[PDB]
Every structure is written in structure tokens, then in C-alpha cells.
Amino acid sequence: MSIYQEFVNKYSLSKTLRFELIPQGKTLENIKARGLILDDEKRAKDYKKAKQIIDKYHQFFIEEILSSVCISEDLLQNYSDVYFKLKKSDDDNLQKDFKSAKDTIKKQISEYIKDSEKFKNLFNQNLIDAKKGSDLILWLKQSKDNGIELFKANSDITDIDEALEIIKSFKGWTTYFKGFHENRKNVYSSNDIPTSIIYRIVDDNLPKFLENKAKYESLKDKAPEAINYEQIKKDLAEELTFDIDYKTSEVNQRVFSLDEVFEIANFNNYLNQSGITKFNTIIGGKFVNGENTKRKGINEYINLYSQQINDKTLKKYKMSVLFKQILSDTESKSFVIDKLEDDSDVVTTMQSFYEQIAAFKTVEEKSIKETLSLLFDDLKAQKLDLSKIYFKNDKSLTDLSQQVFDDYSVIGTAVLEYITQKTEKAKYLSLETIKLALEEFNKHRDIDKQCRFEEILANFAAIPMIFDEIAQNKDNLAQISIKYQNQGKKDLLQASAEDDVKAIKDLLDQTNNLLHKLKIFHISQSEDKANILDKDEHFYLVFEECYFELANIVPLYNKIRNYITQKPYSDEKFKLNFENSTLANGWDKNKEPDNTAILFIKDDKYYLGVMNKKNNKIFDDKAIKENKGEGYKKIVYKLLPGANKMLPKVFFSAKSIKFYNPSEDILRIRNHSTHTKNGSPQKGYEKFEFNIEDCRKFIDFYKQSISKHPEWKDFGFRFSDTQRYNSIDEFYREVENQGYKLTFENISESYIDSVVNQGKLYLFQIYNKDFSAYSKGRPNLHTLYWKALFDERNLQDVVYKLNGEAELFYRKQSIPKKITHPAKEAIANKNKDNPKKESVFEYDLIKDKRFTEDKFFFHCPITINFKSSGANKFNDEINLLLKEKANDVHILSIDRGERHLAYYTLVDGKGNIIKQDTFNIIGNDRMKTNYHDKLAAIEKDRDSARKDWKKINNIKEMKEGYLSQVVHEIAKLVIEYNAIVVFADLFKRKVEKQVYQKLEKMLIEKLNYLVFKDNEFDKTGGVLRAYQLTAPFETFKKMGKQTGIIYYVPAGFTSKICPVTGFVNQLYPKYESVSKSQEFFSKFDKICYNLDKGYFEFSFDYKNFGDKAAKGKWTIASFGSRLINFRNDTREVYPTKELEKLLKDYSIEYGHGECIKAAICGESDKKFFAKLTSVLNTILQMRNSKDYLISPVADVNGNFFDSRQAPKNMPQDADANGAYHIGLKGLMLLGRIKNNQEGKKLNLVIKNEEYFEFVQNRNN
RNA sequence: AAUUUCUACUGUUGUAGAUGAGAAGUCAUUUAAUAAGGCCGU
DNA sequence: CTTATTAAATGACTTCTCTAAAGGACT
DNA sequence: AGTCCTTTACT
Ligand SMILES: [Mg+2]
Ligand SMILES: [Mg+2]
Structure with a gap:
């Protein structure tokens, strides 16, 4: 039945599972006998101070690298001219001359930081543990001999002397920082990543300084008078001081003029956080103590001038602040109150x-x-x-x-x-x-x-x-x-x-x-x-x-x-190390002595075992031979990771290159990298275009070299014929897919037991509550995913793989053990609808029991759909299935309201509504909870709590553990009804909308890997064949308008519109003078009174009215009731009766049908037209709340739409009409997918006129 | 009112559903104080 | 209500890794 | 000449 039987195993992704480690037997006594826990506690507390200490030097290194930097003015000028051309021009001369203007300035800054002496050793063992001679230990000794107190700032470190002692701590642990170094390599990377000072400077700050230059030279023309210049040279003189003017290149320090700070060439004085601050202060101004008034800034002078002359165009020139420089610690130029340190x-x-x-x-x-x-x-x-x-x-x-x-x-x-x-x-x-x-x-x-x-x-x-x-x-x-x-x-x-x-x-x-x-x-x-x-x-x-x-x-x-208002310090979990700088870092058999961690299975129970650093030969092949017996199934793990690196590292190893003996032709291919289209050539050589013959020649060289390798032939590789490969990442794919094997060895229980006693091995049970003997009934998705890591049916065709670099954590008790409900004492059930009003337990129940003891934890990374790597043009495959199957698809659309955190209408290919219901109350939720109120009051409590200086509690877990419920109802809906989900982009233009955004994100992530706890492990929907219906999340910017079965449509005119006629109020009727009223109303076509029906009729065409984007001849009645909120509260207004009360005030006769069109626009009165443009605002106001939506425009039967009474195929109120009309824009979107032709690019931008045409003429 | 953890639970030493972790950086918002200003209060 | 400055807080967003074995240093 | 922590391989 389901149309997605084929969207399974589309791509691989990464996940991590968490368990509790229950220690076994004497391990806990043996741990503390060695005080390994207290020791790791202190080594986290130092590791923090260690990276703090390092950063203080990356701080110095950023600042001296950047006052050295200069960007050639005519390089900036090349960026600017091209950057504005990207606005209002789409050309690819432009895109090319921009990526080349952006990449050359980053090259110019990256060369500069790559040549300096501090850089080489910035990321290696010489930074903290120089073998013969060490960079950080100099810098700390330079800055002590310069008497410069780096650690006044942070309380946890006294002087520079202590900071030496802490760097010394990590003598043999340089590798422990490798991941930290990764976070620092990112600070300088020329790549297109936001963590980089080069990215901050070229991608973030240059545009912003350019937008402000355009706003500075465009302010002077429209409002020359806005900024009082003499006072900002007298107020902000400090932060106009710039040693170098870079347009003149004069080296004298002197207060600039604003005309000079907006020299494109002077952007170079705002590169560091010192000059970022100075630029930002010219924008923002500053306080001074002793001065009562505050010294103003450019952004205030724009503001104050625009409220003086009542010109709200000037807001367009509000200047943008520059983002702080990355890793910079910085205090302001404005006054900062002294601080209190204790009670x-x-x-x-x-x-x-x-x-x-x-x-x-x-x-x-x-x-x-x-x-x-x-x-x-x-x-x-x-x-x-x-x-x-x-x-x-x-x-x-x-x-x-x-x-x-x-x-x-x-x-x-x-x-x-x-x-x-x-x-x-x-x-x-x-x-x-x-x-x-x-x-x-x-x-x-x-x-x-x-x-x-x-x-x-x-x-x-x-x-x-x-x-x-x-x-x-x-x-x-x-x-x-x-x-x-x-x-x-x-x-x-x-x-x-x-x-x-x-x-x-x-x-x-x-x-x-x-x-x-x-x-x-x-x-x-x-x-x-x-x-x-x-x-x-x-x-x-x-x-x-x-x-x-x-x-x-x-x-x-x-x-x-x-x-x-300061949040009190909280003891958190800390990493556990069991004396290995590299613990669980790699599961492979050959590394078992270097990384200490081993897994075991016994009687469907899972164990993790971490050998004592002093006895890591405990499980060598010898010890596994003389201790073979039927007790514990040790996992033995064999991986070939990153084939693209590892086969060259190993074959062309100086150690072993001579044995594999590559021919001078295969070396040719390696040095010039002819086997790749964007790969690197060996240093000293030049990259050559990609040659397919060379590519298979190389692959063959790898192939022979794998069978000659003693160890790697154990994997049993069954490669395709090397004449199938068009690119060498396909060979690497097979090497990696089949470079992962899990076998076992049976080990005497008696052996494990005596080794665990002696503290030679620390054995734990990997636990969650599903491994309870009492746990009958559905396991967590996570318990599924882990048990499959070893299932025979996972191991013939690996879809769940076991990643290296797992971590173990200790968590000290945090609330006292309190026996909240004693045993055999009945406890009332919160569910007023339950059959059992209360329930009694043979055993004690303790609130938050997981927190009344210390616990050990195991975080474990896995890789899903291991073998079937990656998906490009994923949407294109979704769109393909949808075109062919488009009669079968349904549109689930989801809108937000004021009353509704989220709402949903299921509509079919015609436009009929199959289901519509709110999400303020879930399910199928045996305990009805209007979450809209639950969060409402949890949010009020926080605003209340901020004001009385009480603790600010988290809302996100309440919200997340709530949407977790609706994304479960959204998966079930999509698979059953073969739907695509359509959301509103963000007519219609921050906390009610982030529960709406938060839903979208937990749904994109849940459509990445969808498993129905109920489907058979072997078939589609299940553990091995899991639905993928969204392309993987990368950036919201890269993601755009579609991500799989999810789509976004422009959200305009979905709230206020007629579901049946497609009418929308674009008249926007306002009153300003009698003449424009007497001129607007005349523009009508006919204004009559219908006798046989008993309301008024304003027939007209939209084009005649002023705005041009207006198409349609409509007739709009005053039939029905209406609502309006006043301050005395809301009152029921009948405009049909409100008009009768106005004509007979001004003597116009209406009671025989005669068109009154001429009479109104002839009369002088201002009051007369003021209540009339008002009764017209009520005639068109389709949403009426205190809630329902009403329609003035008749259908063919001459009936008028009321949400209070609508069939099931039409909305039940204005909120569902909102989501109903998102789903109508989805129905439109379905169209262009069905009628898409091959070779073409889908169009996914709906314009308001193609919408109006589609909603207007579908019914009529 | 038990949890790898989160939510709601009693679903009976647990039930249903959810659950990508560690590090790193950055940004946005709220509330408060304060300075100068706007308008058909808040 | 705006434009700003400080403080304290929660939250959300984009980066990196999720390795075996070569290679070198102290011993 | 053995141990074992540090780099290494590419893209
Ligand atoms: Mg369960
Ligand atoms: Mg709870």
C-alpha cells in the first residue's frame, strides 16, 4: 500500500547511543581503592584550566597576526563594486568575479597567518611538551617577565606560576587535546566555516561595514543634518583615534572624521576586536560615570532626527554593529559597574x-x-x-x-x-x-x-x-x-x-x-x-x-x-579516563592495548570492560587461547577506516613501500593525482587532469596490495571488476563498506571473574531499563538500534556499525534519596478518566531516583545505514516518486495560530479535507493535556520568575518532550496517507513561532531515520529497512524550500481568505480625507440593497481601485454577525443593521432596492464617511475572535461561508483555514511536480497571483 | 510517581512515544537598570 | 513604543571528530 | 631494540 516502500537505506548518518554502566562485582571497590574517580574529577578541572591557559596565547596570537595584516585597497574596492552588483543582478560573471574577490582576500589573510613562527607548533606536542626544547611555556615566561597578569581575569587560576603547573600536568597527554586542537584549527581555517577569524572578517564584517558605507553616503543625501558631527568628535574622540589612515597610508595617530572612517580602505583598522569595538562605539555611543547624560552614537542620532521631523524612511539607515572577533575577550568603552564577589x-x-x-x-x-x-x-x-x-x-x-x-x-x-x-x-x-x-x-x-x-x-x-x-x-x-x-x-x-x-x-x-x-x-x-x-x-x-x-x-x-540573578554553580558529569589518554578511542583488536575498552556479551546482556593500564595484555591471543570456555562472548572488532587515507598511508609507507613495490607508472599517478578530479598531488608536483585509465590502473595497484597485506586479506573483499569504476571514491566505498567485521571469542567466566576481582579489569553492564528482567513490551528505538549492532542479520549486511571514540562519564548524586511513595501505600492516579482511581505497589517509588545515587554512563557513537553512503539530488528522487504517484499523494499541512501551537489539515488531490484537528491536545493521549496552556503558564512563570530574581527554569525540554508526541502523530499520518508535509515559511508578515520552528526541526530529524516499533525487523519500515523521507539537515540556508517530503510555501493570504470563493481583502480601506472617500467609493461599480435577501450589496472590480495587482469582479455582502475588540472586551456587531442605522441618519432611502451608490459620495460629512469606512472594515474582516471565520462573497447557490457550520471537507475555523490554505498551496506545488518534464528544474516559488488564480477559480 | 536522558504517566521493580553525543565558537532573545526621544498607555 | 549602554539569564545556530598504523623518541 | 605516545594518511 505505501508509496515509500523504496525510500529506505538511502544514505548513512551518524548517531550516538547512551547507556548506564552498572559496575559488576569488585570493580567499584577496586576503582576507589585506586581513587580513579576523584582523580579524573581533578583532571577535568585542570583540562578546563589547561585550554583556558592555551586560549590566552591564541588570544595573543590572533592580535599580533592581525595588526600585521593589511588588505590592498583596490582588493576591497573589487569586493564592494561586485558585492552590490550581486544585489539587483543575478549574473554569473558576477558570481565568479565575487567568489574570486572573496577568495583572494581570504588567501591574502591565510598566507599571512600560515607563515608565522607561532603557527607551526600551534597544534602539536611541542605546544605543551617539547621533546628536546615549548611554545606555550615560553609565552607564559615572556608574559611573567613582562609582569603581565594573564589570570587576574579568571578566578580558577591565581598567577602565571599556577598556569605553568597546570600545563605541566599534561606531559604525556598531548593527544588528549587533539579534539581541542581541532576546535582551534577551525579558528584559522580559510575554508568557508563560521568558526574562523578569516570567515568572520571577510564573510561577516566586511559586508556589514560596506552596508554602513552605503548607508553613510546615502544618509548624507536625504538627511544631511541627522548627525551632530562636532559632538561625536567631542564625545567619541577616543574611538576615532586610528594610528594608520590606509587611504593616505600616513602613520600618525589623530582623530578621524566620519568621512575617513568610511573610507573603504580604512576597514583595516576594524579587523581586531579593539577596532571592532571602536567602530561599534561610533555606532552605539557610550556611558561615562560622573556624566549623567549618555554620550550618543550614530544610531541614536539617526533615531532622534527621524522622530523630530516625522520621517520613518530614515529607519532604513540604522547602522549594523560588527560582530566580535572570534576568541576575543573584551571589555567595553562604556562604563561597567563594579562587581560583587560574595554575599x-x-x-x-x-x-x-x-x-x-x-x-x-x-x-x-x-x-x-x-x-x-x-x-x-x-x-x-x-x-x-x-x-x-x-x-x-x-x-x-x-x-x-x-x-x-x-x-x-x-x-x-x-x-x-x-x-x-x-x-x-x-x-x-x-x-x-x-x-x-x-x-x-x-x-x-x-x-x-x-x-x-x-x-x-x-x-x-x-x-x-x-x-x-x-x-x-x-x-x-x-x-x-x-x-x-x-x-x-x-x-x-x-x-x-x-x-x-x-x-x-x-x-x-x-x-x-x-x-x-x-x-x-x-x-x-x-x-x-x-x-x-x-x-x-x-x-x-x-x-x-x-x-x-x-x-x-x-x-x-x-x-x-x-x-x-547569577545562576549557582552546578556539579556536572565529568569524563572518565581509567588512566588512558586514548580510552575507547578505537575498538579494533590491534589497538586493544592502546585504547583500553572491550565489549562482551553474556546471556543477552551487554558488558563493557576496561583493562587496568598496568595489565592491558590481559586479552592477548595467548590469554584468549588458554582461557577459551563458555562464559563471556568478547566482541573482536576489525575496521578499515577512511580507505582514501589509509591505503596510501600504508602502502606507500617508507617502512613498507619497498615490499608493495609500486611501479614508476603507479607513482606517476600518485604524484600527479591523475586518479582523482579534485584530489591533491604529492608535494612538489602539479595536479593533472583526471585520467580514467590511470584511475583503474591505480585501483588495481591497491587491489594487489590488499591481498599482499598480511592482515587485511582476513576481511574477505569481493570488489566489482575494476573496469566498472568511473571514479576512485567508488573503490574506496567498497573498501570501507566491507572493512568492518564483528566476530567473537568465548572466554571462561572463571577467567573474567578472577581478573575483575584483582582490579586487572573493570567490568560494567551496559544498561538501560529495557534490559530489566521485568521489561516486557516495546523497547526504546535506541535499545533496538544497539542490539542490532551485533544481530546476525545486521552482520551479514551491515546497516548498524560501531564507531570508535566512545566516552564514559561519572555523575555525582544531586538530590537526596527521598522515598516519595512508600510501598504498599496506595497512590492516587492523576488521570481522572482511569479505571483505577489509585494504585498500590509492592515496592517503594522514589522521585527522580536516577539522581539519588552516583551513576556511571556510557556514550557510544554508531553509524546508520552504514553501507549505502550518501544521497545527492535526494529531493529529485522524492519529486520523481511523487510525479509518477501524484494521484495517490495527500497533503498534510500544518499552520500555527494564536490559539494553537500547531494545527493540521489533511487534504487530497481535489482539495477536500480528509482530517483536521488541533495539536494543543494530542492523541490518543490517555491523559488529555492542552499543551497550549501547559506551555503558556510555563512561559508566564518564567517572565514572572525573571522579575522577582528567582531561578529561570528551562522550557525547551517541556517543548521538546511535547513535540516528540506530535512528530509521532505526524510520522503515522504520513506513512498511512502517503502524504507530504507542507509548512509556512518564516497576509501574514517570537516564542509561539519557535515552538512552530522547533516542530519542523524535530520532524526533519525524525524523517531522516524512521522506524516503526511494530514493523518486522526484516522488511520496510523496520530496524533494517528504515524509512528515509527527508534529505539530511546541513544549513537552513542550504536547505531552502524543500527537504524531502517536507515543503515550505510563502504563507501570505492563508488566514484571511474565503475557502469556497477564494476572495481576499486587498482594498485595504482607510479614511484620511472626505475627498479620497468620496473618490474611493465612486470607484465602485454598483452599491445596491437586496430586498429579497435583506442585506447590502457592494458590487465592484478590483482593477478600478488604485493598486494595480488587483484582479476580479466581486460582490461583497454585509450578511451575518461580526466581532470587534474594544477597551471599556469584544462586542457582536451586525453591519447589515449598522448600515440601516446610518442611512436613516442621513435621510437616504433604501427600503425598495434602489442603488444608493451616488448618494454617499455626494455628501460632505466626515462623520458620515467615518462610520461607513468602518462598517466596511467589518464587512470584510473574515476572522472574528474573542473564534470563527466568515465570508461576504456568495457562491453560486448564493450562500455565505460560516465556520460555525461547515462540512467536514471545509475548515472548522479560521485556524484550520490557515493550515487548509497552506495545503492548497501544497496542492499547487503537487501540480508542478506531476506536470514537470524530464531535464527541467522544478519551480517551487508560488506568487500571489498564481495562487489567487488557483484558489479563486477551482470552485468557480 | 521509577527513566541513558526528555515529556506525559501507573501503563506494577516499570508503560507510550521521543532521543546525535562530546568539544568549540558565535549569535538571537528576554527581563532588569540607565541615557536621550516619539505616539490615539501599554 | 524607538535608538542606544551595562548586567544577569535561556536558547539556537554552524564548525570538528567519531581510526588504524606509521613513525619517532625515550629507554 | 622494545615500549608507547604522537602523527600520519587525504579531501
Ligand atoms: Mg518501553
Ligand atoms: Mg517526569
């Missing part, structure tokens, strides 16, 4: 503040509490001349009016009509002008609903009491302080103290808001002489003395926030 720095800094604010005394020798009560009681008693005392015309004045009158613009517009009773905003506003303007404002306002000056004098009269709110709290605070006055405990961010953190923050909040209440009075000395004001000097004298002392809260608040 004791939190109690001390609090005391000293709240003490001064109690101890401080004004000039007049009056406390902060007395100065304010005196000052404010005086205002409520109106003893103060109100012209003397002003408010700041600020967000602070706006906050006042909201707090006291419950609308912000109240004070604003009250003083704007009393002035008129051209004037600028005043910097400050007097209290008298406030009391008069609102005194006359309330004269016009209603007596019930009016805002009195006496409500303002309420707010402040009451300020003094905030200090008695604080005094009793600053006193139980004294209790809490004693608890944490401990010189480095740092045990206050431990979630147990969260009740005490709530107390400390309410102090800090009450004292913050009190500041934000006084703030409206303060007259900052921000140096403006443009205006001055004549205050009440006495009041301002002793106020502004108080205010400054309280202002010292905002640096206090940040420090405490910044220490209590």
Missing part, C-alpha cells in the same frame, strides 16, 4: 548605603526624613509660591498624570489649550501653570470625570511615609544580614534563600520608586544655558541635597541584581 559584599554595600541615607544631614542639619516631610507638608498647605517650583516636562510628568489621573496625556493637553488660551515644548513647567490649565481643563470636562490639582498634592504629601515603610524593613534586614556576612560564601543565590531575596528586593524596589517619585523635581546641571529658570532657592537647596544622596541607589541596585 559579604552584598550586606556590606547595603548597610553602608542605608546607613548614610539615615545618617546624612542637609546644610540646615536636618535628616533626609525631616527635610522631605517639611518640604511636602508645605506644598499641601500651599505656602509655597507655585511659580517658584516646577516639574520636569518629562516621561516623569507623563508618569505623574498616569499615576494620579489614570491617563498620561491629561496634563499634556490641559497645558496645550490653556496656552492657545507656534510654541515649543518647555524644558520644565511651573506648578502654577499646571494648576490653572487643569483648572480651566476641568471647567470644560464633566464634573463626575474630572482631575483636580488636589490629587497631585495628594501623591506628594504622602511621600514621607515611605521612610517608615523602609525603617521597619531596614530592620528585619538587620536579621538577614547576619546570616550572609561570610567572607566568600556566595550561598545567597542558592534557591533556598529565595524568601530572603524577596525581602531584599522589596527594599531595593521601595527605595527605587521613591527615587522615581522625587525625580520629577530635580534640575540636573546638564549644561544648557539656552534657558534658565528662577526657582524657590531654599526648597531646591535642601531637596537637591537629599536627592543626590538617594540617587546613590541605582548603582547599588544594579550590583545586587547582578549578583542575585
